Design a protein around this ligand. Structure first.
Ligand code: C8E
Ligand code: C8E
Ligand code: C8E
Ligand code: C8E
Ligand code: C8E
Ligand code: C8E
Ligand code: MTN
Ligand code: MG
Ligand code: MG
Ligand code: MG
Ligand code: MG
Ligand code: MG
Ligand code: MG
Ligand code: MG
Ligand code: MG
Ligand code: MG
Length: 548
């Protein structure tokens, strides 16, 4: 029920007018996900493509938007792995760290700045759940996982969290994760934290990625006033063999929010520096980019109406000043039913390669989105449902000009989509269903954009019988257009749609020991999300956790 992703501070989801999805760790353990993509692919509006199995490059297409038009936050801060390519790829991010996901669709540059065009995915790594745990798993393709985790009180008012994880999967991918946290309450209103973690990955032509992130902050959580001051530093090193991509990202943010009337008003200032090593991302020199943004947010309930807003101004060391804004109005016209209307602008900053690489244009402006969305939400006969339509006009897309061998702002895209979701129970069965239609086109030429499913259906059915907890996952991935690079001029090819099924079980052997089982791709269906790149096939997994 609570989220922080909408305006940075806690609020109930019912008061967030944008469609909103929350995934908890209970969900991730039940689903038996061995990657971040597997979690995300289940959610509304998400279309993930991957050059094969785990560890391989991937892209996230939220609601038809480009790969680079989703904002991935880790504990509220822009994902470091995204900064060199300017495009979020979570294949290397360790699933072991994911305690919660809050995923908000629709624009949100008016709070977060760059990249929040299709939506915002915030991966949270914090848990409140004392104790010690050991866990492990084996599966198909010699998959193997071991994991030790711990959270305990060091006296009154201070807690410590530790975790280590080893994951390995042949064709392949090797991941080692370490994470520690200290949380401290100076009073019941004032809190502080220091966090550090990092991970060492190898992917097979070989890839050796290493990242470490450190975060530190103060929060004030009062009856009316809420405040946060947060510091983050990330250092990544990305070897392909040989080529080295290295980036340091520093972040400081100060936000406040106060409860006023039946809602709130907030403001903050957001500063970001990114330094890259020479040769990073096929750019010759090392670069230092800086961004500052100041934004305002507000929520109010009057009568049957809810109004939500945000507005931001970003000053970028390369393109200068760009402003964004968004509003939503919602009207509960009969109890349990609501009509919601939203408008929002957002942007994407140019990336290092586009700006300074062999074909760079140092004068590029940001890509700009205007979105309109309308929705009906309802609770009918024990069924919670919602249906939205949205229109997204993207312009000044950064395209390569083949005649002058330089990038320019010129492209246009028009995306018209529909999202429909419902959840409900039938006796002991729980159903979670969504449907997405996404008509994403080049607006000059009126031709469909490549790499995106026009349609997806997603169905989750959970139930408990003896003490077995069962979960079935269904996905239809619709027809998709891609290019075939095996032959030049590269031809556009049509990839047929596919139905995919998973089956997962959990059993508490004792009150301390849970054993779990999964068959991913129950019908050994052969398919690609990227033309040429074979996906998994039926895989089996068998795992356990021991708590004390
Ligand atoms: C005191 C400032 C609160 C508003 C900040 C964000 C406003 C963004 O644009 C809204 C203006 O245009 C639409 C007017 O309708 C509702 C305004 O938002 C009310 C916020 O609770
Ligand atoms: C806190 C509230 C923020 C609300 C912002 C409203 C949106 C700004 O639109 C007002 C008009 O916008 C510009 C129109 O004309 C000037 C620009 O056109 C020429 C291009 O440079
Ligand atoms: C207290 C923080 C207020 C931050 C508000 C900035 C709102 C962002 O602008 C709204 C969208 O931008 C539209 C106007 O952009 C053109 C800038 O005009 C500059 C003055 O000529
Ligand atoms: C696109 C949204 C359309 C929503 C239509 C809903 C209109 C009214 O629906 C519910 C009205 O209540 C009727 C339900 O049956 C009454 C149950 O009440 C129990 C005791 O009176
Ligand atoms: C109020 C939620 C809208 C539900 C949409 C389904 C009804 C379709 O009726 C009209 C046909 O729409 C044609 C275009 O379809 C994609 C449009 O998506 C919205 C952007 O305009
Ligand atoms: C869907 C229009 C009817 C009113 C909303 C009912 C709630 C929808 O919840 C079910 C979501 O499940 C799949 C719905 O698929 C059909 C809707 O697609 C329409 C595309 O234009
Ligand atoms: S949960 C981490 C932890 C708690 C305590 C028992 C105090 N420790 O020595 C470690 C650091 C293992
Ligand atoms: Mg091995
Ligand atoms: Mg203090
Ligand atoms: Mg107070
Ligand atoms: Mg403070
Ligand atoms: Mg500073
Ligand atoms: Mg509308
Ligand atoms: Mg010519
Ligand atoms: Mg189809
Ligand atoms: Mg096979």
């Amino acid at each position: 029920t609570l989220v922080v992703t909408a305006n940075r501070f806690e609020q109930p989801r019912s008061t967030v007018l944008a469609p909103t999805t929350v995934v908890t760790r209970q969900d991730i353990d039940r689903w038996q996900s061995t990657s971040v993509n597997d979690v995300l692919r289940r959610l509304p509006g998400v279309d993930i493509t991957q050059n094969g199995g785990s560890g391989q490059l991937s892209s996230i297409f939220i609601r038809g938007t480009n790969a680079s038009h989703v904002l991935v936050l880790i504990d509220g801060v822009r994902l470091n792995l995204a900064g060199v390519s300017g495009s979020a790829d979570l294949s290397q991010f360790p699933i072991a760290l994911v305690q919660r996901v809050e995923y908000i669709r629709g624009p949100r540059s008016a709070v977060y700045g760059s990249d929040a065009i299709g939506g915002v995915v915030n991966i949270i790594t914090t848990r409140d759940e004392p104790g010690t745990e050991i866990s492990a798993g084996w599966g198909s393709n010699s998959y193997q996982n071991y994991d030790v985790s711990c959270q305990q009180q060091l006296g009154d008012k201070t807690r410590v969290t530790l975790l280590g994880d080893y994951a390995h999967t042949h064709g392949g991918f090797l991941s080692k994760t370490l994470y520690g946290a200290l949380e401290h309450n100076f009073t019941d209103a004032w809190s502080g934290f220091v966090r550090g973690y990092g991970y060492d990955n190898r992917t097979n032509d070989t890839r050796k990625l290493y990242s470490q992130s450190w975060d530190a902050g103060l929060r004030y959580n009062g009856e009316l006033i809420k405040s946060q001051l947060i510091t983050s530093y990330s250092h990544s090193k990305d070897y392909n063999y040989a080529t080295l991509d290295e980036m340091k990202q520093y972040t400081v943010q100060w936000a406040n929010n106060v409860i006023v009337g039946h809602g709130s008003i907030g403001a903050g200032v957001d500063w970001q520096k990114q330094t890259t090593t020479p040769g990073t991302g096929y750019v010759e020199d090392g670069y230092d980019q800086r961004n500052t943004g100041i934004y305002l947010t507000g929520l109010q309930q009057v009568g049957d109406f809810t109004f939500e807003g945000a507005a931001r101004s970003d000053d970028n060391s390369q393109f200068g000043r760009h402003g964004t804004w968004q509003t939503s109005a919602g009207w509960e016209f009969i109890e349990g039913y609501r009509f919601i209307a939203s408008y929002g602008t957002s942007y994407k900053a140019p990336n290092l390669g586009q700006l300074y690489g062999f074909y760079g244009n140092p004068n590029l402006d940001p890509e700009k989105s205007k979105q309109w969305e309308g929705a009906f939400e309802g609770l009918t006969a024990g069924v919670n449902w919602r249906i939205s339509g949205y229109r997204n006009d993207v312009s000044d897309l950064i395209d390569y000009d083949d005649h002058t061998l330089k990038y320019y702002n010129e492209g246009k895209a028009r995306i018209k989509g529909v999202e429909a979701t419902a959840n409900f129970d039938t006796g002991p069965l729980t159903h979670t269903v969504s449907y997405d239609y996404v008509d994403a086109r080049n607006a000059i030429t009126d031709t469909p954009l490549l790499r995106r499913a026009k349609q997806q259906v997603k169905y989750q059915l959970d139930w408990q019988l003896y003490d077995f907890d069962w979960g079935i996952t269904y996905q239809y991935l619709g027809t998709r257009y891609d290019k075939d690079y095996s032959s030049y001029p590269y031809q556009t090819v049509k990839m047929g749609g596919v139905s995919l099924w998973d089956l997962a079980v959990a059993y508490p052997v004792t009150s301390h020991l849970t054993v779990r089982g999964k068959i991913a791709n129950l019908f050994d269906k052969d398919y690609e999300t990227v033309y040429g790149y074979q996906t998994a096939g039926r895989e089996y997994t068998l795992s356990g956790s021991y708590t004390f």
